[PDB]
Structures are given as structure tokens and as C-alpha cells.
């Protein structure tokens, strides 16, 4: 009746970490990305699979799902997540290789806000509301058309802990209202503000740009502890630096105000993803 072509040729490893690997693969002449999970992070494969079994997300700023595969091995289970392949790689990667102009900076950040608002929104008749819980520049991919897409729904919640450097104050001080779905959207907005800061630094104005740095590069070590981050974010209430040169540029002046309104200590004071999108459409 029909041939079901399931062979994927794994061609090159494009990412490796504690808890698995991503490969560029080929299926029927087409590039795909294959994430192979460590057994120690099996729950991330299960959570992303359970979410996509609930709602087949389809959005230009969400990494495109193709398949979840479980294969029996003699004394283990092999878990693969197969998605669209973005040859430009992660935003984290990209910001070290390039500087940005005004149009390219705004296009990047509005595309991220668009993907995030799509996750956050409940649609009736539709999708549940979804919070990401690990938003960061390594979890955003750059597309050839200059927009980005959000990746990794292994920690997502529908209505493992997040990367410590990007944790909101209420996560670090353990006050977060864990029974309130809105709490998790507000944690994503905090992380979005940090990403917005990372990108804005690489936008040129008046011949000036900042070097790529991660959030809090100047106040915490590499692989910062929970306590390192709690002291910076909660006890001292530090926030990333806004350089003086941004205040000569109307785009970076507006982006500075936006990122401040993602970083309030009080989670309910933070902007929503939809309000961030509106603000970004009125900049320039
Ligand atoms: C199982 O595993 C994998 C399968 C595939 C794949 C390969 N050819 C064809 C298919 C296909 C799709 C859809 C239908 C429909 C046709 C309409 N009818 C009313 C209902 C059924 C049939 C067949 C698939 C899904 C790719 C894979 O990798 C990319 C797979 O491994 C993850
Ligand atoms: C998983 O991913 C890929 C899958 C395929 C693919 C292979 N065979 C068959 C299909 C298919 C055919 C027909 C229906 C039906 C559904 C109900 N009704 C009857 C109208 C249409 C659904 C599915 C697909 C989608 C191609 C892909 O790329 C070209 C995939 O992407 C990697
Ligand atoms: C974050 O999370 C996921 C990401 C991806 C993913 C999708 N497209 C492309 C990539 C990629 C390709 C190429 C490079 C680099 C390497 C070599 N060179 C120096 C520059 C280019 C980097 C990254 C990835 C990693 C897939 C995933 O799942 C299948 C992910 O997990 C959900």
C-alpha cells in the first residue's frame, strides 16, 4: 500500500551539551534538525512531545515541529526530536559574528515577541496558553529572512529548571506563585527583557557598538550559582547596564525603556508580550 521513509542521514553535529546533541540531518533530500536526548533529560522529550500531542503549534516564530521518535535499543530507549533546520544557527551564535542595523535589530526582537505572544495566548475553538520557562538567546534560532524562532519547549507549561542566569527574581527568592499560570508568563517576560538587552548591544549607532556579552557578565561568574544570581537580582536588585550611547539613538532609547518594563521586581508590573509587540511596531 505505501512506503514510509523514516531514514534520516545524520550529517554533522551542530550542538552538544550535558543533556544531548543536535545534528543537521537529511530526510528525502531536505535538511532537518535532530535533537538526540540524554536519558538524564528524557523528561524534556516527554514534555515537548506531550505538548505537541495536545496542540500542533504552527507559527513562523516557533521552531517547526516535524516528529518525535522513540526507538527501542537492546538495553536503552533512544529519543529524537526532529524539527526544521535553521542553517544560520542560534541568536547567541549570530550576535558574536555580526553587528545589526536598526531595521535588523527591530526585526529580530519583534519576531521573538511575536513567537512569545503566540505561546502566551489562549485561542478558543485553538491552543492552550503556554509559558516557555527557559527563554534565552541559545534557545532562539535565526532564519534566513531575518526573523527568529523560539526553540525548546522541554520545560513549557500549558494552561529540569530554567537557566539560572536568566531566572526572574521571584524564581531565585522562591516567592513565585507556582499555582498561578500568569506567574510563568511573567518569568518569560523577564527573560525576554534580557534577550532584548543582548541584541540591542549589537545594534550600531553613531559608529559605536558594544561587544556581545551575556546578561550579568560583569557581576556573576560563568555557570553562576543560584546564590550568585539571587544576591545580584534579589538582594542588590541589579539590572543590566544601559550604555550612555543608547540615549543618542531614538531606537535604543525606546528599547531601553521597554527592557526596564520587563525587569520590575513586582512581576505583575511587567509588560505583557502583546504590549511589547505593540510598542515595537511603533518604534521607527
Ligand atoms: C513513522 O515515522 C516516521 C514517518 C514519516 C512519514 C514518512 N512518509 C510518510 C508519512 C505519512 C504521513 C501521513 C500519512 C497520512 C496520509 C493520509 N491518511 C488519511 C492518514 C495518514 C501517511 C504517511 C510519514 C509520517 C517520517 C518520519 O521522519 C521524518 C518518521 O519518523 C519520525
Ligand atoms: C512529518 O513530516 C512530513 C510529512 C510528509 C508527508 C508524507 N506523506 C504524506 C503526507 C500527508 C498526505 C496527506 C495528508 C492528508 C490529511 C487529511 N486529508 C486526507 C488531506 C491530506 C496528510 C499527510 C505528508 C505530510 C511530508 C513532509 O515534507 C514534505 C514532511 O516534512 C518533513
Ligand atoms: C535550541 O534548541 C534546538 C535547536 C535546534 C537547531 C535547529 N536549527 C539549527 C540549529 C543550528 C544549526 C547550526 C549551528 C551552527 C554550528 C556551526 N557553525 C559554526 C554555525 C552554525 C547552530 C545551531 C539548531 C541547534 C534544533 C532543536 O531540536 C531539533 C533544538 O531543540 C529543541
UniProtKB/Swiss-Prot annotation:
Catalytic activity: L-threonyl-[receptor-protein] + ATP = O-phospho-L-threonyl-[receptor-protein] + ADP + H(+); L-seryl-[receptor-protein] + ATP = O-phospho-L-seryl-[receptor-protein] + ADP + H(+)
Active site: 134 (proton acceptor)
Name used for this protein in its record: Activin receptor type-1
GO biological process entries: activin receptor signaling pathway; acute inflammatory response; atrial septum primum morphogenesis; atrioventricular valve morphogenesis; BMP signaling pathway; branching involved in blood vessel morphogenesis; cardiac muscle cell fate commitment; cell differentiation
Taxonomic placement: Eukaryota, Metazoa, Chordata, Craniata, Vertebrata
Source organism: Homo sapiens
UniProt entry keywords in alphabetical sequence: ATP-binding, Disease variant, Glycoprotein, Kinase, Magnesium, Manganese, Membrane, Metal-binding, Nucleotide-binding, Phosphoprotein, Receptor, Serine/threonine-protein kinase, Signal, Transferase, Transmembrane, Transmembrane helix
Family listed: Belongs to the protein kinase superfamily. TKL Ser/Thr protein kinase family. TGFB receptor subfamily.
Function: Bone morphogenetic protein (BMP) type I receptor that is involved in a wide variety of biological processes, including bone, heart, cartilage, nervous, and reproductive system development and regulation. As a type I receptor, forms heterotetrameric receptor complexes with the type II receptors AMHR2, ACVR2A or ACVR2B. Upon binding of ligands such as BMP7 or GDF2/BMP9 to the heteromeric complexes, type II receptors transphosphorylate ACVR1 intracellular domain. In turn, ACVR1 kinase domain is activated and subsequently phosphorylates SMAD1/5/8 proteins that transduce the signal.
Cofactor(s) this protein requires: Mg(2+); Mn(2+)
Topology versus the membrane: Single-pass type I membrane protein
Binding locations of ATP: 14-22, 35
Residues of the full protein shown: 201 to 499 of 509
This enzyme's EC code(s): 2.7.11.30
Cellular localization per UniProt: Membrane
Expression sites by tissue: Expressed in normal parenchymal cells, endothelial cells, fibroblasts and tumor-derived epithelial cells.
Enzyme class name: transferase
Pathological association: Fibrodysplasia ossificans progressiva: A rare autosomal dominant connective tissue disorder resulting in skeletal malformations and progressive extraskeletal ossification. Heterotopic ossification begins in childhood and can be induced by trauma or may occur without warning. Bone formation is episodic and progressive, leading to a debilitating ankylosis of all major joints of the axial and appendicular skeleton, rendering movement impossible.
Consequence of changing residue 126 to W: In FOP; variant phenotype
Domain Protein kinase: 8-284
GO cellular component terms listed in the entry, alphabetical order: activin receptor complex; apical part of cell; BMP receptor complex; plasma membrane
GO MF annotation list: activin binding; activin receptor activity, type I; ATP binding; BMP receptor activity; cadherin binding; metal ion binding; peptide hormone binding; protein homodimerization activity
Cytoplasmic side: 1-284
Assembly, per entry: Interacts with FKBP1A. Interacts with FCHO1. Interacts with CLU. Interacts with type II receptors AMHR2 and ACVR2A. Interacts with BMP7. Interacts with GDF2/BMP9. Interacts with BMP6 (when glycosylated); the interaction may induce HAMP expression. Interacts with TSC22D1/TSC-22.
